[PDB]
Structures are given as C-alpha cells and as structure tokens.
C-alpha cells in the first residue's frame, strides 16, 4: 500500500502509463511536422472548390 | 521522561526532511524535460554548422 521497491501495481504504472503517453505525444508532434507543408492547405481549398 | 522529551525532537526533525524531499524529487523530474530542450538545441546548432 505504501509503495515498496517492487510493488506489482505501482511499478507497472511507471513503465506503462508514462511510455504510452510518450508515444502518443510523439505521434501528434511528428504528425504535425508532416502536416506543416503549405501544399496540404491548398488541398483543403481544392476540396471546397471542387465541390462547388 | 528525559529521554522521551529528547527523542521526540528527532521525529519532527526527520519529518521535515521527508516533506522537503517530496517536492525536490518532482523538480528533478521537471529538470529532465528542460535538459532535453537545450540538449536538442545544442545538437541542432552543430547540425547547422555541418552544411
């Protein structure tokens, strides 16, 4: 309960909760880097233009 | 009784140490993020000098 060196639950959260979010954040960070292109913003305009 | 009054001081003295270390370990974890920010910047400048 207090939290020993190798507590099954607490220790598991240290590697799971932390790393999982890290990868998730990386996806958004790396995903935003790939979406910074100005040609992708022109495609959005195309979509609206093509539908009209 | 003499010892009782003298041994009680340690309890409160040791309790203060734990209270101070609790906030110091959180700052140590926060330093990591800041350290990586300047470490990536230092390497970024080195990569800019390789061109």
């Amino acid at each position: 309960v207090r939290g020993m060196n190798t507590s099954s639950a607490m220790s598991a959260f240290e590697r799971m909760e932390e790393k999982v979010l890290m990868q998730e954040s990386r996806a958004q960070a790396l995903g935003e880097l790939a979406g910074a292109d100005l040609e992708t913003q022109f495609a959005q305009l195309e979509g609206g233009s093509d539908v009209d | 009784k003499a010892s009782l009054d003298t041994q009680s001081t340690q309890v409160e003295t040791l309790k203060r140490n734990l209270i101070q270390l609790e906030s110091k370990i959180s700052e140590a974890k926060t330093k990591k993020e800041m350290l990586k920010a300047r470490i990536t910047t230092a390497k970024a400048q080195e990569q800019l000098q390789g061109m």
Binding site: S25, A29, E32, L33 | K43, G50, M51
Partner: peptide, 27 residues
C-alpha cells in the same frame, strides 16, 4: 563528384534527426 555525393547524403540524413528532436521538444 566523389566529395559532393557523400556530403549530399549526409546533410540530408542530419535533417531527420533535427525533425525528431523538434518532435521531442514539441512533446
């Protein structure tokens, strides 16, 4: 050519690390 090809391939691979570092900074 020999001194340009090697530099062109090494200067482009260094940008990938820079982008990865920015992702970590963004994270």
């Amino acid at each position: 050519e020999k001194m340009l090809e090697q530099a062109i391939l090494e200067m482009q691979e260094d940008l990938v690390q820079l982008r990865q570092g920015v992702a970590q900074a963004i994270a």
